[PDB]
Amino acid sequence: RIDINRIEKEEDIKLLKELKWNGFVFYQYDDEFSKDRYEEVKAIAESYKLKVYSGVKIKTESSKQLRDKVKKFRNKCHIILIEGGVLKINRAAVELHDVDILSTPELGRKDSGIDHVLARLASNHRVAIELNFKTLLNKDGYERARTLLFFRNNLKLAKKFDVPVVISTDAENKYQIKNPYDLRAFLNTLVEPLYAKKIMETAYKICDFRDYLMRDNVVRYGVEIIKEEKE
Amino acid sequence: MITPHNILRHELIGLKVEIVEAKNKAMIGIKGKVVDETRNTLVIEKEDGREVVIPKDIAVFLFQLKGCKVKVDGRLLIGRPEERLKKKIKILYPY
Amino acid sequence: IEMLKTLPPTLREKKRYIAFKILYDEELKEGEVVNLIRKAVLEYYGSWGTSKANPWLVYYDFPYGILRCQRDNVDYVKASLILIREFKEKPVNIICLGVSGTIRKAKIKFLGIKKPKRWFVIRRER
Amino acid sequence: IEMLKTLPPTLREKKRYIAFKILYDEELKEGEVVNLIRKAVLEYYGSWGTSKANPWLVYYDFPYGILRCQRDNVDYVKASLILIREFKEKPVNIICLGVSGTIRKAKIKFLGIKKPKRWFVIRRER
RNA sequence: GGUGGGGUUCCCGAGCGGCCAAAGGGAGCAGACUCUAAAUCUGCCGUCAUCGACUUCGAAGGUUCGAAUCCUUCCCCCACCAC
């Protein structure tokens, strides 16, 4: 069970560990990332009992110059997220086949979440869709209606094409975070409970795959062990 | 020299190999050299003396290099070695 | 350009079109109709049912009106139409005439006589 | 006297008891909790779901709380608990601990340690 | 439902089956130049970043001594049609 949120204080994360949570993701939505924040993430993760995987995020830049610079800044960190309602950057983001999870098709667009050609290209390039929840807690009633209509449309377009889905709260403060049983009961309320469990299983397996990829000398899934001829 | 990075394009014939995981239960536990190689198939001669026909895409291989032991899927080894050294790019996602 | 392809009809949302009337001697703006039907569709469905049955008004010129629905849940939309009681000084009356799959057929069954096509001409002329 | 017999347990409503907490450093009255949970249970259920899942708060002394539910729809009540966003100057936080069939068991699993019985003594002494 | 077509470098665009042959232009970096800057010119031009060499011509399979090119399949992108 893996959450995606930002780190502010230690008591909040100590409350997170005491409930159910085994690990989470530190969320860098900025262009200024250094090793000091990641060392503070190490300190708060070793504070009580946890492991945290850090990522980086970009919003509203060019088409594929952004793709090259995003690869160059991605070569330092573990995982990544690209958010944006623009379809033009979304096509390149699902085309570059190296982004793990994808967010924001509903609030920058306000028309429809995922296109059919977009969902078929995501099936060929294996990019996952991340569903946020802070968008549900900063809107009005009919806005909640249109947003959950978009999520149910994207849920069908991910179910029929077997597109991987990761749920998160996309939190910002101490109290924006919610329970994992709550998110499981909500995704049970929407369509199905087995797919709700599959979302959490995929959320664990994608971080497991990124950790197993960047852990050792693994290139295109090739494991190399004792007595290497490494230059 | 044979490198663990270019083992996706190095020749497999003439290298000792054992497999560690496969869907076939009796396939697990073999040790031998590579003699013949087709598009998704190795012909492996055991030390005991039995020739076995091993499909690549169902198992993972551990090739024994000069000191090294490298674990590569046969899904990465898809294609004839002629076309594999031509150029084959395989990207695998075990989700 | 910002364009989204229509989903194939095996995958798109199966829809119905409810034709109804808002009976009163009083008058309404179509935005007031959209506001009252959003308040009522919340008050009968919550977030879950409003994600379920997909409410959107498509036409209101006269006190008659046409609204779009999901196919499996037209009875839920009708029950949402019943529980109108009051709008700020007065009620409005919502009375359903029927339900069909298109505008040309629901327009002639209860609403009118002829079959108009206006979307094509406002797309090709403008 | 005005008395109503309890329905037999084959015919009565199958119920569950959700234990939760309203996390904030701020304070609340139990009537404010009942008002906010009624507004939220309307905002997620409508008349149909509130007839469906039977919401009623039974206990609130601390920021912990106990509320009663139908048996088949505890996930709906939890999803009703998630969508709290704001109460007039501020949010409140609702965080579920668990769900059980009674007070003596849900009181010891997450809430406390001992098993109190107060209804019997306030019925027999008063 | 229908016809005539296109997909090549960050963006607009050429290219005989053959030596990064990959015309290129704009862009980035560096040099040169200038008091500074614009314009012009030079090299890297995706990488090593001096010559030079390797990769990408939407994707896969196949033909061939050898594929951007020739064949098949899977796709997408254009243009215009209700009268």
UniProtKB/Swiss-Prot annotation, chain A:
Write down the EC number: 3.1.26.5
Question: What is the enzyme's class at the highest EC level?
Answer: hydrolase
Please provide the record's keywords in A-Z order.
Cytoplasm, Endonuclease, Hydrolase, Nuclease, tRNA processing
Question: Which GO MF term does the entry hold, naming one?
Answer: ribonuclease P activity
For biological process, the GO terms are: tRNA 5'-leader removal
**Principal location listed in the UniProt entry:** cytoplasm
Catalyzed chemical reaction(s): Endonucleolytic cleavage of RNA, removing 5'-extranucleotides from tRNA precursor
Task: Reply yes or no: does the keyword DNA-binding apply.
Answer: no
Q: Where in the cell is it found?
A: Cytoplasm
From the UniProt record, list the coiled-coil ranges. none
Family matches, as InterPro entries: Pol/histidinol_Pase-like (IPR016195), RNase_P_comp-3_arc (IPR023539), RNase_P_p30 (IPR002738)
Q: Name one Pfam family in it.
A: RNase_P_p30
Q: An example Gene Ontology cellular component term from the record?
A: cytoplasm
Q: What does this protein do?
A: Part of ribonuclease P, a protein complex that generates mature tRNA molecules by cleaving their 5'-ends.
- Of which family is this protein a member? Belongs to the eukaryotic/archaeal RNase P protein component 3 family.
Task: Cite the record's note on assembly.
Answer: Consists of a catalytic RNA component and at least 4-5 protein subunits. Forms a subcomplex with Rnp2 which stimulates the catalytic RNA.
What is the name attached to this protein's record?
Ribonuclease P protein component 3
Lineage here is: Archaea, Methanobacteriati, Methanobacteriota, Methanomada group, Methanococci
UniProtKB/Swiss-Prot annotation, chain B:
Q: Name one GO biological process term.
A: tRNA 5'-leader removal
The catalysed reaction is: Endonucleolytic cleavage of RNA, removing 5'-extranucleotides from tRNA precursor
This protein's UniProt keywords: Cytoplasm, Endonuclease, Hydrolase, Nuclease, tRNA processing
User: Known EC number(s)?
Assistant: 3.1.26.5
The UniProt entry, under Gene3D superfamilies, shows: Ribonuclease P/MRP, subunit p29 (2.30.30.210)
Q: What does this protein do?
A: Part of ribonuclease P, a protein complex that generates mature tRNA molecules by cleaving their 5'-ends.
In terms of SMART domains, this protein maps to: POP4
User: What does the record note on quaternary structure?
Assistant: Consists of a catalytic RNA component and at least 4 protein subunits. Forms a subcomplex with Rnp4 which stimulates the catalytic RNA.
Q: Which Gene Ontology CC terms are recorded?
A: cytoplasm; ribonuclease MRP complex; ribonuclease P complex
What is the organism lineage in this UniProt record? Answer: Archaea, Methanobacteriati, Methanobacteriota, Methanomada group, Methanococci
UniProt KW Cytoplasm keyword: yes
Q: Where in the cell is it found?
A: Cytoplasm
Report the Pfam families cross-referenced here.
Answer: RNase_P-MRP_p29
Q: Name one GO molecular function term.
A: ribonuclease P activity
Protein known as? Ribonuclease P protein component 1
What protein family is recorded?
Belongs to the eukaryotic/archaeal RNase P protein component 1 family.
Curated annotation (Swiss-Prot), chains C, D:
What are the recorded Gene Ontology BP terms?
tRNA 5'-leader removal
Under Enzyme Commission nomenclature, its number is 3.1.26.5
Q: Does the keyword Glycoprotein apply?
A: no
Keywords linked to the UniProt accession: Cytoplasm, Endonuclease, Hydrolase, Nuclease, tRNA processing
Q: InterPro entries given for it? A: Pop5/Rpp14/Rnp2-like, Rnp2-like_sf, Rnp2_archaea
What domain of life does the native source organism fall in? Archaea
Example of a GO cellular component annotation carried by this entry = ribonuclease P complex
Which catalysed reactions does the entry list for this protein? Endonucleolytic cleavage of RNA, removing 5'-extranucleotides from tRNA precursor
Give the GO molecular function terms: ribonuclease P activity
Where does it reside?
Cytoplasm
* Record has Phosphoprotein as a keyword: no
Protein family: Belongs to the eukaryotic/archaeal RNase P protein component 2 family.
Function description:
Part of ribonuclease P, a protein complex that generates mature tRNA molecules by cleaving their 5'-ends.
Q: What is this protein called?
A: Ribonuclease P protein component 2
- Source organism per entry reads Methanocaldococcus jannaschii (strain ATCC 43067 / DSM 2661 / JAL-1 / JCM 10045 / NBRC 100440) (Methanococcus jannaschii)
